[PDB]
């Protein structure tokens with residue numbers, strides 16, 4: 001293995017690691033070699049899960065972390081239930097409270113650059129976008145940040161902790177200059 005891979009395994013809970021492996025293997029990639037993308041997928045997974053963990057019990061439907069086929073099935077059910085237009089690209093969550101799909105982004109650059117890259121791909125303006133950065137910035141469609149400040153602050157804190165641990169192992173630079 002690699003040092004990034006050992007760190008990923010001691011940084012994220014086993015269940016998130018397993019989901020990141022399945023997600024990568026489903027798209028033909030190997031966590032043992034694509035170790036920077038392994039850490040990113042794990043990170044994006046954890047953020048998605050803390051995000052859904054913010055708010056009420058039945059508020060979100062978690063799309064990320066399922067296999068492509070099942071995720072599109074739930075997405076289909078949500079659209080055929082609420083009437084929301086079917087997104088072109090698989091989103092990360094659905095907000096039953098706001099009746100909109102959510103795309104969660106985690107970036108090592110300026111949240112400004114990432115959101116533009118996502119909003120340009122989505123085009124379907126119905127899908128909400130919420131970007132977090134490893135420096136603690138955030139940016140969301142309509143400045144509607146969906147969750148309370150405390151739930152978002154926990155996500156920002158966790159992201160900076162992952163940044164510090166990677167740097168302590170001299171892995172952060174390679175992780176940053178890889179997105």
Ligand SMILES: COc1cc(CCNC(=O)c2[nH]c(-c3c(F)cccc3F)nc(=O)c2O)ccc1O
Nearest residue numbers: 023024027029037040041044090091092104105106
């Ligand atoms: C094609 O990309 C891949 C996607 C996956 C499963 C994750 N599914 C997503 O839809 C997704 N992916 C990413 C993302 C990325 F686009 C590049 C690098 C790291 C990432 F986390 N960010 C998101 O916010 C998001 O929702 C597995 C393997 C892939 O190669």
Ligand SMILES: [Mn+2]
Nearest residue numbers: 064090091092
């Ligand atoms: Mn996704």
Ligand SMILES: [Mn+2]
Nearest residue numbers: 092103104105
């Ligand atoms: Mn996402």
